[PDB]
Design a protein around this motif. Structure first.
Motif, PDB file in Angstrom:
ATOM      1  N   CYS A 248     -10.346  36.909 -51.974  1.00 18.73           N
ATOM      2  CA  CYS A 248     -10.357  35.573 -52.555  1.00 18.73           C
ATOM      3  C   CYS A 248     -11.719  34.922 -52.375  1.00 18.73           C
ATOM      4  O   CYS A 248     -12.163  34.177 -53.249  1.00 18.73           O
ATOM      5  CB  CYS A 248      -9.270  34.689 -51.944  1.00 18.73           C
ATOM      6  N   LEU A 249     -12.421  35.236 -51.282  1.00 15.60           N
ATOM      7  CA  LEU A 249     -13.811  34.838 -51.107  1.00 15.60           C
ATOM      8  C   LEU A 249     -14.723  35.481 -52.149  1.00 15.60           C
ATOM      9  O   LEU A 249     -15.794  34.930 -52.451  1.00 15.60           O
ATOM     10  CB  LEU A 249     -14.228  35.196 -49.678  1.00 15.60           C
TER      11      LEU A 249
ATOM     12  N   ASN B  62     -15.739  40.380 -62.905  1.00 15.18           N
ATOM     13  CA  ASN B  62     -15.353  39.042 -63.336  1.00 15.18           C
ATOM     14  C   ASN B  62     -13.890  39.017 -63.765  1.00 15.18           C
ATOM     15  O   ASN B  62     -13.438  39.839 -64.565  1.00 15.18           O
ATOM     16  CB  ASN B  62     -16.259  38.577 -64.482  1.00 15.18           C
ATOM     17  N   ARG B  63     -13.181  37.996 -63.276  1.00 12.19           N
ATOM     18  CA  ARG B  63     -11.738  37.858 -63.428  1.00 12.19           C
ATOM     19  C   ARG B  63     -11.283  37.590 -64.862  1.00 12.19           C
ATOM     20  O   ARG B  63     -10.096  37.767 -65.157  1.00 12.19           O
ATOM     21  CB  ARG B  63     -11.228  36.707 -62.552  1.00 12.19           C
TER      22      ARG B  63
ATOM     23  N   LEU C 200     -13.699  35.588 -55.262  1.00 10.24           N
ATOM     24  CA  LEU C 200     -13.562  34.616 -56.341  1.00 10.24           C
ATOM     25  C   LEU C 200     -14.190  33.266 -56.020  1.00 10.24           C
ATOM     26  O   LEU C 200     -13.918  32.294 -56.730  1.00 10.24           O
ATOM     27  CB  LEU C 200     -12.092  34.401 -56.693  1.00 10.24           C
ATOM     28  N   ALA C 201     -14.990  33.171 -54.976  1.00  3.22           N
ATOM     29  CA  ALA C 201     -15.691  31.935 -54.670  1.00  3.22           C
ATOM     30  C   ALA C 201     -17.200  32.098 -54.586  1.00  3.22           C
ATOM     31  O   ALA C 201     -17.922  31.242 -55.099  1.00  3.22           O
ATOM     32  CB  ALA C 201     -15.161  31.349 -53.357  1.00  3.22           C
ATOM     33  N   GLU C 202     -17.706  33.165 -53.953  1.00  7.57           N
ATOM     34  CA  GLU C 202     -19.149  33.240 -53.741  1.00  7.57           C
ATOM     35  C   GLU C 202     -19.813  34.586 -53.997  1.00  7.57           C
ATOM     36  O   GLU C 202     -20.955  34.767 -53.564  1.00  7.57           O
ATOM     37  CB  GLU C 202     -19.523  32.812 -52.310  1.00  7.57           C
ATOM     38  N   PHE C 203     -19.159  35.532 -54.670  1.00  9.69           N
ATOM     39  CA  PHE C 203     -19.787  36.824 -54.936  1.00  9.69           C
ATOM     40  C   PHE C 203     -19.479  37.347 -56.333  1.00  9.69           C
ATOM     41  O   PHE C 203     -19.780  38.504 -56.641  1.00  9.69           O
ATOM     42  CB  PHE C 203     -19.372  37.843 -53.876  1.00  9.69           C
ATOM     43  N   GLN C 204     -18.903  36.511 -57.186  1.00 11.03           N
ATOM     44  CA  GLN C 204     -18.513  36.903 -58.532  1.00 11.03           C
ATOM     45  C   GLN C 204     -19.742  36.851 -59.429  1.00 11.03           C
ATOM     46  O   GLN C 204     -20.407  35.816 -59.522  1.00 11.03           O
ATOM     47  CB  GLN C 204     -17.423  35.980 -59.054  1.00 11.03           C
ATOM     48  N   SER C 205     -20.043  37.968 -60.084  1.00  8.57           N
ATOM     49  CA  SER C 205     -21.181  38.082 -60.980  1.00  8.57           C
ATOM     50  C   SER C 205     -20.727  37.971 -62.437  1.00  8.57           C
ATOM     51  O   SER C 205     -19.567  37.679 -62.739  1.00  8.57           O
ATOM     52  CB  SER C 205     -21.912  39.402 -60.731  1.00  8.57           C
ATOM     53  N   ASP C 206     -21.670  38.204 -63.354  1.00  8.98           N
ATOM     54  CA  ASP C 206     -21.368  38.305 -64.777  1.00  8.98           C
ATOM     55  C   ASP C 206     -20.890  39.694 -65.181  1.00  8.98           C
ATOM     56  O   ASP C 206     -20.678  39.939 -66.373  1.00  8.98           O
ATOM     57  CB  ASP C 206     -22.596  37.905 -65.601  1.00  8.98           C
TER      58      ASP C 206
END
Lengths: 376, 309, 197, 188
Positions: free
Chosen positions: D168-169, D180-181, D171-177
């Motif tokens: 879940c972290l 991606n969800r 989905l807060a600070e390591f999601q790139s382009d």
């Protein structure tokens, strides 16, 4: 807590999403809605419910600094647990990232969009009455700089309030009524069609990340004022204007010379031109035309004028800005002599050796030499 | 700046909480727990404390009293710092009045913040205050889960302006004093557990006192005053309140906010008090780093403690 | 006149109670065929912690053993070297005859226990007298409980989650031809059998 | 011949297509899971009835390695709940979630069953090196996550974290382009 889902949009913020959910359930505001969902969140033994706020102006997961993980776990819980049928709640997240632009501005993901952080608006936000009465929602696009009004009807707003205060769509709500008068409130159309898929301009179709990298790069380096004919002037005369200004800059930096000929520094020549193109953010070269133009202008003139561009004095600094590596990896590659070293801040290399090393070894899946050859 | 001697004495001082059990035969008896001694084959206690079968509700009781001991230091080595501090508190109560701190303490008394993790799994709790000096019948706050949620909702009560005004007179008038008696009714479910305080040992032994022959758990004297002083919501990029220490300590997630690198601890703010009497003698005061530091300093003199070298 | 073998637990990275308990779970998986109630579990080590590195099931006459030891559980488990089922050795008669009983007083010391007990105590006030107030059945306010070990199993068709307890009495070798109740202990109380080391 | 026009880009065939910058990574995945040569008949039969006949395999795996768990039902690190079909399917070689649906469907499965069975899939006690395989990190990046308390612990290779918090972290600070969800809201 059972709720009622609103209609999912692709041009939607999150504050207006909670206003939608509050105003079809039967809450008179969203403060009581936020109190009720925090009570439901401590009702289900969540290990981060203390930091979930009561005000709506910083509901977003980038406003917090310490519990963004509990923030998005709370959003997973509201997505999976409290609606009768789960709407598009997780996709409308408004986060921070790992990624960062050049030179020193970090990046943020909104769905799939990647914006920078510095020109993200932290003040009051205007809106249009027609998309607030006929549609009802409030887009996320209203707090991106360079955008003024909507897609079709194209009216000038009342941005500042009409006495001297500032109207906001998240303070009084989405009812458009101020607290003093009790009544409801072509390059401009080109940027609004630009943001509509109605691409009628000689600047062609484009993805989002490199779009916003270039717009923010111009607005951060050049430090100009706000005008719509200005940014139709910058991007409807390709390739005349940018070639003219880089010829003016290279004449200005070859006429004024402080350093010697054998010690020509690259940053004193192209500091305002060469830095902010490569990591904006990633390794795509399809519509990232600034790397195509800059690499072509460097490629056709390596050894022109008795070898001036290929032989430049480098302090081995900007290499670790542009080779996508660290200083320990630089030391491990120098100690196995993959390139000739003819310390970090000491001069050890030239521009041509780093250029050939990029052409040889450090090419990624798309960022290479053979995707911009026929663009000249 | 920071002499050999400087010490303040505290304004709020609460007492032990006491837990009692009410029966349908209309009486009340103390609450008792049990250890179990873990033996080996051929030592550490484990205490458990659950609500007895067939009861009606738990009644908790304590008493808090607000005084005026913040207006002058209990000790001071030099007649140069005391002048600054007495006119600091005088300009604070002239310009930006005592109502924010008073409401922000009385909220933590009136909703059951001092029922530490005892209102999880609970149906309704009802708090009754008996103030002194006072004329009238008692001040009731009823069903705090579904009737009292925010600062605007407390102010729509009959007996709220009088309570906050007698706290303001206690903090303002020299040789002044207010005294509240608090008792709160908890309707816990059948065989719900109770969480009192625990003794410092370096498992799970409770703090206890003897009430007429029966031992009882208490939930603290120093613990219950660390729940009326959870008002610190002024640290940089704030989201969630704190106990008003000098170094912004959040307990469970170990790290301390308001580290002295940021300059938002008590000593870096205290050593710039001639700037605060500079700004509060003007005609406008910014609520972002000048009101939010005077609030912290005045909340941190009410706590007390010795400010020495 | 019968014998024991040691299913040894040697991966050298394991918790012991949580493997022994599901060994007894699949022991209860056996003996639904019909009530052939002839197995003892016989944990041969018992410290003041750590239920032993062994388990030692007993059978009666050499063939019912390998109806028990092919209990659909080790056949897809023993491709590699994790456990060791010992190979059917007639007993050395130098051991000690100890007991294993589930005692049901570790389980009924808890506050839930006397809650259930007092609510049963006027569930059956139907020998109609004067009803008490329950305000006087205050619990044992100081208690010295002895040593015990707990095994975490669950109910056979419902989702009811108890545990089960084991002690190590020593008592009186010769008694009968050793039936029990269902899953393996010696709290039958019609024939309370010691099953050896 | 169906594999032969699976490597050429013949977009008239009932086997569900992908861009062919990663069909070789799909070949490497099929040779790594089955531990044999690149079969064709079982390859087409495996992708014949997407997504019916592999989700059964991934669920039977996460139930098979819980019927015979070594230590217990808790205090168990994440491999022997998803060890082989999880570590051998993530990097193939670039993680754009538009092409590697093998990653994406198991990760949607490990998105929608976090808080089932009293939180079984949530508290998987795991180390800090896993982030350099999961969270697109380095070890000093995780140290800056730990001592500044965005990522709260409970030694580098020591088990100190849990899966639900580390993803879940994500989905807060390591999601790139790239990772991606937003691709997975119309598939399930």
């Amino acid at each position: 807590m059972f709720l009622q889902r609103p209609k999912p949009y692709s041009d939607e913020s999150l504050e207006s999403f909670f206003i939608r959910v509050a105003n079809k359930n039967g809450y008179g505001d969203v403060h009581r809605f936020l109190e009720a969902t925090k009570r439901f969140l401590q009702d289900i033994d969540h290990n981060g419910y203390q930091t979930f706020p009561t005000d709506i102006t910083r509901i977003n997961p980038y406003s917090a600094k310490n519990s963004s993980s509990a923030r998005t776990a709370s959003f997973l819980k509201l997505a999976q647990l409290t609606f009768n049928e789960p709407p598009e709640l997780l996709g409308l997240a408004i986060n921070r990232t790992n990624m960062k632009y050049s030179p020193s501005t970090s990046a943020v993901v909104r769905g799939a969009e990647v914006f920078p952080r510095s020109l993200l608006r932290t003040h009051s936000i205007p809106c249009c009455p027609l998309c607030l009465r006929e549609n009802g929602y409030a887009s996320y696009l209203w707090h991106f700089q360079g955008y003024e009004y909507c897609h079709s009807h194209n009216v000038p707003l009342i941005t500042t309030c009409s006495c001297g205060k500032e109207f906001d769509y998240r303070v009084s709500g989405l009812k458009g009524i101020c607290c003093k008068c009790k009544e409801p409130i072509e390059a401009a159309c080109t940027v609004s069609n630009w943001l509509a898929g109605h691409e009628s301009k000689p600047l062609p179709n484009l993805p989002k990340s490199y779009r916003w990298g270039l717009v923010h790069w111009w607005m951060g380096i050049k430090d100009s004022e706000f005008d719509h004919f200005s940014f139709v002037q910058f991007f409807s005369n390709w390739p005349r204007s940018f070639h003219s200004i880089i010829e003016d800059e290279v004449e200005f930096n070859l006429e004024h010379a402080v350093v010697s000929t054998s010690e020509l520094r690259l940053k004193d020549l192209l500091g305002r031109l060469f830095f902010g193109s490569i990591r904006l953010p990633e390794r795509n070269l399809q519509h990232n035309i600034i790397l195509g133009e800059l690499l072509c202008y460097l490629e056709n003139r390596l050894w022109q004028d008795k070898g001036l561009i290929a032989n430049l004095k480098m302090n081995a600094l900007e290499a670790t800005v542009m080779l996508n590596c660290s200083l320990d990896q630089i030391a491990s590659m120098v100690e196995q002599r993959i390139l000739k070293p003819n310390d970090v801040t000491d001069y050890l290399f030239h521009f041509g050796d780093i250029f050939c090393l990029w052409l040889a070894e450090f090419q990624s899946d798309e960022f290479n030499r053979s995707f911009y050859v026929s663009r000249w | 700046k920071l002499p050999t001697n400087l010490a303040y004495e505290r304004s709020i001082d609460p007492s032990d909480v006491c837990f009692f059990v009410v029966w349908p035969d209309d009486r009340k008896t103390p609450l008792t727990y049990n250890s179990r001694t873990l033996l080996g084959q051929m030592p550490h206690q484990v205490d458990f404390c659950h609500v007895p079968y067939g009861a009606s509700h738990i009644e908790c009781s304590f008493s808090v009293s607000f005084s005026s001991e913040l207006r002058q230091p209990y000790k001071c080595n030099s007649s140069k710092v005391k002048q600054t501090l007495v006119q600091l508190v005088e300009l604070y109560e002239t310009k930006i009045g005592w109502t924010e701190l008073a409401t922000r303490y009385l909220m933590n008394i009136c909703n059951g913040k001092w029922l530490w993790k005892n209102t999880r799994k609970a149906y309704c709790w009802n708090i009754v205050l008996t103030p002194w000096p006072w004329n009238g019948e008692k001040v009731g706050f009823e069903d705090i889960r579904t009737n009292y949620t925010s600062r605007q909702d407390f102010k729509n009560n009959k007996n709220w302006s009088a309570i906050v005004e007698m706290i303001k007179t206690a903090f303002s008038s020299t040789d002044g004093l207010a005294i509240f008696e608090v008792r709160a009714t908890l309707h816990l479910p059948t065989n719900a557990m109770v969480r009192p305080s625990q003794v410092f040992t370096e498992s799970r032994v409770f703090q206890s006192t003897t009430i007429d022959g029966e031992r009882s758990p208490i939930l603290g004297a120093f613990k219950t005053g660390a729940a009326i002083a959870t008002i610190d919501d002024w640290y940089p990029e704030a989201t969630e309140p704190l106990r008003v220490g000098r170094f912004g300590v959040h307990r469970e997630d170990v790290t301390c906010y308001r580290h002295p690198s940021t300059g938002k601890d008590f000593f870096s703010i205290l050593q710039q008090a001639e700037h605060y009497i500079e700004v509060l003698s003007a005609n406008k005061t910014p609520a972002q780093e000048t009101i939010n530091d005077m609030h912290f300093l005045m909340a941190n003199l009410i706590k007390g403690g010795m400010f020495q070298h | 006149k019968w014998y024991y073998k040691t299913i040894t637990f040697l991966p050298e990275l394991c918790n012991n109670e949580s493997l022994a308990a599901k060994c007894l779970r699949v022991l209860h998986g056996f003996n639904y065929q019909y009530e052939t109630r002839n197995i003892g579990v016989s944990f041969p080590l018992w410290c003041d912690a750590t239920v032993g590195k062994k388990i030692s099931f007993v059978s009666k006459n050499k063939i019912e053993l390998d109806l028990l030891l092919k209990q659909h559980y080790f056949v897809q488990m023993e491709q590699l070297q994790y456990f060791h089922i010992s190979n059917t050795v007639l007993v050395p008669e130098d051991c000690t005859y100890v007991s294993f009983r589930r005692c049901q007083s570790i389980d009924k010391l808890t506050a839930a226990g006397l809650a259930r007990k007092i609510r049963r105590l006027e569930k059956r006030a139907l020998s109609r007298g004067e009803q008490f107030d329950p305000s006087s059945f205050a619990q044992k306010e100081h208690t010295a409980i002895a040593h015990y070990h707990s095994l975490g199993e669950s109910s056979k068709q419902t989702n009811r989650n108890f545990r089960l307890n084991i002690r190590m009495l020593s008592e009186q070798p010769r008694e009968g031809n050793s039936i029990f109740s269902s899953y393996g202990l010696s709290n039958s109380e019609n024939s309370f059998q010691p099953v050896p080391l």
